[PDB]
Amino acid sequence: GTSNRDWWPNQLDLSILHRHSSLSDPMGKDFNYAQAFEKLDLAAVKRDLHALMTTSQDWWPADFGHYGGLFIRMAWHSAGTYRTADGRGGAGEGQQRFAPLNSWPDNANLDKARRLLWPIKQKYGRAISWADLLILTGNVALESMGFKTFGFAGGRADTWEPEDVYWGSEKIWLELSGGPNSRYSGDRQLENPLAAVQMGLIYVNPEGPDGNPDPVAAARDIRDTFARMAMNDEETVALIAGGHTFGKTHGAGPASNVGAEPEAAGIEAQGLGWKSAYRTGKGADAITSGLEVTWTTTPTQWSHNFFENLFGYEWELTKSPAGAHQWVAKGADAVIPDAFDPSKKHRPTMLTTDLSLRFDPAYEKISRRFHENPEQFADAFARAWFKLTHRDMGPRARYLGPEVPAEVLLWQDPIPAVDHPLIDAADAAELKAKVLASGLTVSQLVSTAWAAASTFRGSDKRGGANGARIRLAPQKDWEANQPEQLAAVLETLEAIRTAFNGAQRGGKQVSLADLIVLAGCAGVEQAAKNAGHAVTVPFAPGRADASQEQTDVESMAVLEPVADGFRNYLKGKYRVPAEVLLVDKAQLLTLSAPEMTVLLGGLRVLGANVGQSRHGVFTAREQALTNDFFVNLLDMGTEWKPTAADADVFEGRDRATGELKWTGTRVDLVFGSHSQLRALAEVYGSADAQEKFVRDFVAVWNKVMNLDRFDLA
Amino acid sequence: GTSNRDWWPNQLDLSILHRHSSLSDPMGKDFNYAQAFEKLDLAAVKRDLHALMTTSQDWWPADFGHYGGLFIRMAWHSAGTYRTADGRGGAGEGQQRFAPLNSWPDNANLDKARRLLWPIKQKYGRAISWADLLILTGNVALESMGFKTFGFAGGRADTWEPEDVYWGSEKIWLELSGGPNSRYSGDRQLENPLAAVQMGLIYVNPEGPDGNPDPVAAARDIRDTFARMAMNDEETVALIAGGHTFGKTHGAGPASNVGAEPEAAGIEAQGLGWKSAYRTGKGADAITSGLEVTWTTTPTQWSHNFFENLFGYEWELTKSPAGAHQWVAKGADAVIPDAFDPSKKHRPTMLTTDLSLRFDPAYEKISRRFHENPEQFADAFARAWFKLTHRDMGPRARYLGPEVPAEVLLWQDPIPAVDHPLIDAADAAELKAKVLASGLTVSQLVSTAWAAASTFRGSDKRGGANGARIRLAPQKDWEANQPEQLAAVLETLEAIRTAFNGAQRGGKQVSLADLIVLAGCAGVEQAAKNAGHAVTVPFAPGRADASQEQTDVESMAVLEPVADGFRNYLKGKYRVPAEVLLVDKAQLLTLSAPEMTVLLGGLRVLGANVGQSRHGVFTAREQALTNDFFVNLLDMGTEWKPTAADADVFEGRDRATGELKWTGTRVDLVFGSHSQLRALAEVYGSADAQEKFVRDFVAVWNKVMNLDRFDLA
Ligand code: HEM
Ligand code: HEM
Ligand SMILES: Nc1ncnc2c1ncn2[C@@H]1O[C@H](COP(=O)(O)OP(=O)(O)O)[C@@H](O)[C@H]1O
Ligand SMILES: [Cl-]
Numbered sequence A, B: 001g002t003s004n005r006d007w008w009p010n011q012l013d014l015s016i017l018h019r020h021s022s023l024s025d026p027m028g029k030d031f032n033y034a035q036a037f038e039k040l041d042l043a044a045v046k047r048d049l050h051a052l053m054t055t056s057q058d059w060w061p062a063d064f065g066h067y068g069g070l071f072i073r074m075a076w077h078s079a080g081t082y083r084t085a086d087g088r089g090g091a092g093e094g095q096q097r098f099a100p101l102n103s104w105p106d107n108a109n110l111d112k113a114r115r116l117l118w119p120i121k122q123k124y125g126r127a128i129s130w131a132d133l134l135i136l137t138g139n140v141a142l143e144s145m146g147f148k149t150f151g152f153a154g155g156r157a158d159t160w161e162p163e164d165v166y167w168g169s170e171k172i173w174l175e176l177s178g179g180p181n182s183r184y185s186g187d188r189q190l191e192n193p194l195a196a197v198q199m200g201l202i203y204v205n206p207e208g209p210d211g212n213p214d215p216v217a218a219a220r221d222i223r224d225t226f227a228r229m230a231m232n233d234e235e236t237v238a239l240i241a242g243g244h245t246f247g248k249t250h251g252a253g254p255a256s257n258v259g260a261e262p263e264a265a266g267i268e269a270q271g272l273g274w275k276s277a278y279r280t281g282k283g284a285d286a287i288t289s290g291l292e293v294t295w296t297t298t299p300t301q302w303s304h305n306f307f308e309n310l311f312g313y314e315w316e317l318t319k320s321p322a323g324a325h326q327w328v329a330k331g332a333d334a335v336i337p338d339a340f341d342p343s344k345k346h347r348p349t350m351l352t353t354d355l356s357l358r359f360d361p362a363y364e365k366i367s368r369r370f371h372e373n374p375e376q377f378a379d380a381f382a383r384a385w386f387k388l389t390h391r392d393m394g395p396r397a398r399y400l401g402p403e404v405p406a407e408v409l410l411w412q413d414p415i416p417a418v419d420h421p422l423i424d425a426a427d428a429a430e431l432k433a434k435v436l437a438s439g440l441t442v443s444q445l446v447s448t449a450w451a452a453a454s455t456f457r458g459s460d461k462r463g464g465a466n467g468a469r470i471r472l473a474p475q476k477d478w479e480a481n482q483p484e485q486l487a488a489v490l491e492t493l494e495a496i497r498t499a500f501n502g503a504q505r506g507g508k509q510v511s512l513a514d515l516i517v518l519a520g521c522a523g524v525e526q527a528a529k530n531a532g533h534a535v536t537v538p539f540a541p542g543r544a545d546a547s548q549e550q551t552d553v554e555s556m557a558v559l560e561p562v563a564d565g566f567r568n569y570l571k572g573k574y575r576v577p578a579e580v581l582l583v584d585k586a587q588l589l590t591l592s593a594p595e596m597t598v599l600l601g602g603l604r605v606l607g608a609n610v611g612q613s614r615h616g617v618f619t620a621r622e623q624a625l626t627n628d629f630f631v632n633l634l635d636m637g638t639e640w641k642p643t644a645a646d647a648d649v650f651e652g653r654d655r656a657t658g659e660l661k662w663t664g665t666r667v668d669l670v671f672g673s674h675s676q677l678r679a680l681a682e683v684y685g686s687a688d689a690q691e692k693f694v695r696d697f698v699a700v701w702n703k704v705m706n707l708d709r710f711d712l713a
């Protein structure tokens, strides 16, 4: 059946904004996963998981009699899709169980691992999400094998459909680089926002770059991809060597024996895939990656034998039974156990990417330290494993259960506790009047609060106005935030704050974070009053102010808006059309298409554009909250044409006289072009719509201001 | 950006079930369009539309100074996509303003027509939908040009995103027959459910079949496509000749001058398309279809000139200025006015498909009768226009406003008015006890009610349990309804009915329609009791019983389920996989995926399968309402394989012994295979889910029983 996407493959896709509707969710509209989790007997879940580790099923027999290695790989791949560029991927939504991730070649046979967990999922039901269970299972695996984890938090609610993520443009699984849809350009520069080297891989190719078995070159790809997953050198080495303390790879025969991935398999496979015609198809005969390596002499027990072997042997290039490149220890004795036959032993083996840990010079220093000091290794691995598996969970207020680590980690973007009474409704009214009496304008107040709150992204729940990180490096200097203008606003608000706080009794005070938001609220109320409408914008206090020392400047870089269509802002010229970047930002904000449309049209007329640009400001009463953006955009009396100077800027002229009325960008005019967006614009540009536009604008503004308020959930 | 549909282009698409969420709808969740419409000043709207008729805009100047022909075409196209096979298409959702229909070649320049209406739409806002406005406009165009319409009803709520309709499989607009994705096979047999001859046409090709200008052959295509739009020969001749009493076609120069359709155009085009480089690109120079025909001597006034011209001249084949085949009157004088230049006149001209009305022998007899009795023509056209524009609106209870025709038409599937007291809760309890005491089983009660209610489709709001048409021809004889079993259940219910009704005073009586549904409710209650659960199922009385003479047996044929996954029924072997047909049915029933899931699993254990098939009956307690379907389907202790006899039937055997435990179809097993469906099945097959399953099942059952209850809306 031919679809709209077939006829118009480059038209903008709004379906991404309308995922996760109540229609697709089997749980009631009142279901609260945190409340269910908080009553889970977590210790009981863990006991059942511990038992499972050594209860082999004959349909996928346990290597060494222990499923721990398999489950650790499972949890690492669940988390391993994360990209810092956009926060997408990660373990936080349990997306491994849906397409495409359930059928990526790097996730081969994890379908088996998830199926092993159905009896426990079934027993506990809604009180433990798949998303939490995948991670918990990896932690129990670790514990069962003698490794002390750093802790665990629940709270990852399940999702019910695939997320729309850009994983690359290749049309062939695992395509090598340099194809017509190459994700690499220049000197091996990987395109943002990607964080894997080949389509369908987690991070890197275990044979080496595009299959070339050079550990030094592979190290480059490890370092780049791991950094794009928010891991530094120490963390990277700790993770890889920690993981590869356990279990084995699977490559017992040729890969041509392996059948269709789950999404392609027949209905009778019941959601499993990669059925193998090689011998028994499983166990001793398993084929997963095609490699056949077993790293340590005790694959079912924590040890420091990975680095003992890495450094204690010289390594020879060899081939697995499937033909993949891998390495074997020269001259070694057969000291590695076989997974099924207690009479067989094997020489030590390694992946190309394992040898990167010794042959890259910066890795080698860390790896040596960890070899000489395994307690340092263990602690780094524990810390890195917690980070890996929690990096997309959001603020610590979302962490549930009895095993949450008390230590506050800098990567969590922590917010200090509030230890004083909060402002009440009368205080809020007093502050809004003081802010308006200062002389700050509607535009300055709206723009400041927008800048502070719109850093949120729902992908990894980072950003937002909590913390008042807008006053700190690097936010205070981002171009989109208008550094000089911002500094002036912040100085004014800080003076109002000082004055109010100095007047109080009983310890009541207002944080700068709360006052930035409140001041934006006052701006929107004032703009409504400028239009003739008396409205109260909701405000919820309780944000706190973070310090510079609590703020990782390098980690915060990925949150810089380089494209913010809500402020008509593009930092440079991109391949992707600006309207596509608008919808991407709207999705990060968690906005629907109606929400996106009302918000943008209101921001344009409040003066929120960076640089005071007139593009899209289709009103003669700027700083009044009206629907003028939509009424003027939709006026057929105006004709639009791209400018000669810039194809991305348009002039709107009166059709009869030629008189210049307006200018606009692609982000402004998509609302009058796209057939779905134009239908939304029409509602708000109708003669009956002024009350509705104000009400809906206020509601979406409040939604944005509150995106990171998990303290109120 | 590669998507899941790219990787797995034949996996089932559940997005069709989660359209029309509250996320994409800009109106509040409590918006009620009927209440808005009922307060519209419809008379005011009609005055504005009358004014618009002759208010020419320079960007698309009005032919003859009157937009009435353009608007008639616009409304006839809005309606003209309707297909009786599935009820999809039609005017009722205003879908002409969205992709793909806004850009079909046959809808060229209707973008202009819609844009002329924006000022009126803006003025009246939410109180008139686009969907109602398009039809109202057509009516006013006819009235303006001297034709008295049969009536008009409002109530077509707007929609906010495209419907997922199968329009065909061709990948080329307008492709002629016999290609790789041909919609024709055999003896020019058009594939169900399509009702057009070429991709992007409304019904037929105006040059003739595949472009061949044979009026007799064209008439075969006219007859078939119009029958697939619910129109008979009389209706067809009346509509074509009535439409073509007005206006003209547009083909002033070669089609290669015409640019991108709306969804392909540049952002500056602001939602319009088909910009033409030919001369002024509009008005006298317009190119729409490529034909250049004006049918009557008064194109802006109702006349009897269409049939005068058709019969009064002999016709010669010629070409338009764009090269399209059309006909010109031999020897005629230049009597047809020019649309723009009072000094030019033209000879009478006709399309191939107009000549079909004279050269097909059955049409010729009707055409002659209309030529000799123009009052008959006028009345037939008025009735056909009303049908055309209301065919998809559903029961008359949904018709709004002061111009609704009082006359009840057979095609409306009319339900008699209720003129007696209805049964109350105490009476319902008495009837349910009588039904359970009669010996009817859970299976018989559930299956009967299911058969009665599940004929509803939301596409055209036809079907459902109101009317008790299950007792009439042809529903009573449909294979899926199990005619012999049905007759025995109906005879028992009719005896209960008669006994109850004869005992009442004051006029109270229960309809058979209500009793069917109530007895199904008693079946579900009894099944829940059989499972240990104490459940009351909601019931709303007020259905009435329609007569056989109120039930057009040929129009009812399209409602026959040839595939009904809910009863594991397939009438024959089809090219479309059964699970796609299940999703199709769910969409017609208005079900989400969770609703489809719970419903199907419950129906399987209640004994609703046709023929008492064991396929998917995964329980040892049939006729008890439990979640057994899910718990057993998901048990990894069972392995599934297709049977040797039939690749579409599967056997589930114990993995350890080989012993046969169950059999199932594709519709049963897709719930254990599709990664989204299986995530839903998991919820209902969890240990905590029995009460959730029962409650959800009751809710969805109640939903289905009330789908046609627009008397209660
Ligand atoms: C450069 C990064 C990495 C590469 C290229 C990589 C590669 C692979 C490959 C090819 C396999 C074999 C799959 C199979 O055939 O069964 C595997 C297994 C495994 N990986 Fe990694 N890995 C990486 C990092 C990690 C990390 C960060 C962890 C966890 C902290 C991890 C834990 C494991 C474990 C436990 C197994 C064994 C699975 C079993 O016993 O079934 N790996 N690795
Ligand atoms: C066999 C069925 C039919 C065929 C093949 C057909 C074909 C067409 C074509 C090709 C045009 C010219 C488009 C353009 O170049 O502007 C047209 C115009 C039009 N049709 Fe039809 N038609 C059919 C039935 C109808 C019916 C059922 C109605 C309404 C009751 C209708 C009303 C009109 C009107 C009013 C115009 C004039 C448009 C204008 O003045 O701008 N047609 N038809
Ligand atoms: N309209 C009704 N008439 C009679 N009983 C009802 C009605 N609606 C709900 N109930 C009963 O109340 C129970 C729970 O009510 P509710 O909270 O509305 O959720 P649901 O959408 O599951 O019906 C139902 O399972 C049914 O037995
Ligand atoms: Cl994601």
Ligand SMILES: [Cl-]
Residues within 6 Å of the ligand: B088, B089, B090, B093, B095, B163, B165
């Ligand atoms: Cl439709």
Ligand code: NA
Residues within 6 Å of the ligand: A087, A088, A089, A090, A092, A392, A458, A459, A460
């Ligand atoms: Na994420």
Ligand code: NA
Residues within 6 Å of the ligand: B087, B088, B089, B090, B092, B392, B459, B460
């Ligand atoms: Na329809």
